[PDB]
Design a protein around this ligand. Structure first.
Ligand SMILES: C=CC1=C(C)/C(=C/c2[nH]c(/C=C3N=C(/C=C4\NC(=O)C(C)=C4C=C)C(C)=C\3CCC(=O)O)c(CCC(=O)O)c2C)NC1=O
Length: 212
């Protein structure tokens, strides 16, 4: 996968996050002699200071998408750390990552990180996305140009986690957030095409954004 260095950086920063469940291993897309050409792996990880990290990785002949959110334990008003690393074709990649605060309409920021006040195709800036939302468009062979920046975001996130050491397990903290992410989101339709209506619905509601 072109995302392997991002994935390794994430779990180098947070080595406590171990796989606790494989929620799905699915084949879909066009069926050939070998089976479906689209593959989904959906993992749940757990570990010190986190409620869960949920990691979805979808790969087919043209695309490679890694959608992952880290949900910290509650009690410290911490944001989640979210990423949507999207290769759509051999020419087109979009990288998104951000601190996603669970409180509706609260503008979160971190001093010293890149700032972006632009407006994007889906979602509402400033509402569960921060002043430092990082969105870049590039080609597949260029993605690691932004790796050092992703590593800075991870460094600041680990500082927040380690400085607070949250122990709460109140999943309702994330209900507004998971509801917002569900409504606003191109995922559902793409998954329905490749994997079918029922599998798409369960993926969005019971795996990606299950704290609604
Ligand atoms: C698994 C399948 C999957 C699909 C099909 C998907 C599609 C998808 N996500 C998008 C944007 C986006 N996606 C995000 C962000 C996220 N979205 C999230 O689900 C999470 C967890 C974040 C975390 C940061 C944002 C902010 C945009 C708008 C950026 C843009 O318009 O380029 C767009 C618009 C891109 C554009 O045309 O510019 C598409 C098509 N994302 C996926 O993960």
């Amino acid at each position: 996968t072109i995302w392997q260095n991002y994935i390794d950086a994430l779990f180098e920063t947070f080595p406590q996050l171990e796989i606790s469940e494989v929620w799905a291993k699915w084949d879909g897309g066009n069926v050939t002699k070998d089976g479906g050409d689209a593959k989904l792996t959906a993992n749940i990880r757990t570990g010190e200071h986190f409620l869960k990290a949920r990691e979805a990785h979808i790969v087919d002949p043209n695309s490679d998408i890694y959608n992952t959110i880290l949900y910290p334990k509650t009690g410290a008003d911490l944001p989640c750390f979210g990423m949507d690393l999207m290769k759509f074709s051999d020419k087109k990649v979009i990288i998104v990552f951000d601190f996603q605060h669970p409180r509706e309409k609260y503008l979160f920021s971190v001093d010293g990180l890149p700032e972006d006040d632009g407006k994007y195709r889906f979602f509402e800036m400033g509402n569960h996305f921060s002043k430092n939302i990082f969105v870049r468009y590039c080609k597949p062979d260029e993605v690691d140009q932004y790796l050092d920046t992703f590593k800075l975001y991870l460094t600041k996130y680990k500082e927040m986690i380690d400085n607070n050491k949250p122990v709460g397990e109140d999943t309702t903290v994330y209900s507004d957030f998971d509801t917002y992410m569900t409504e606003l989101n191109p995922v559902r339709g793409y998954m329905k095409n490749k994997f079918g209506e029922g599998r798409s619905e369960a993926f969005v509601n019971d795996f990606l954004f299950s704290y609604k």
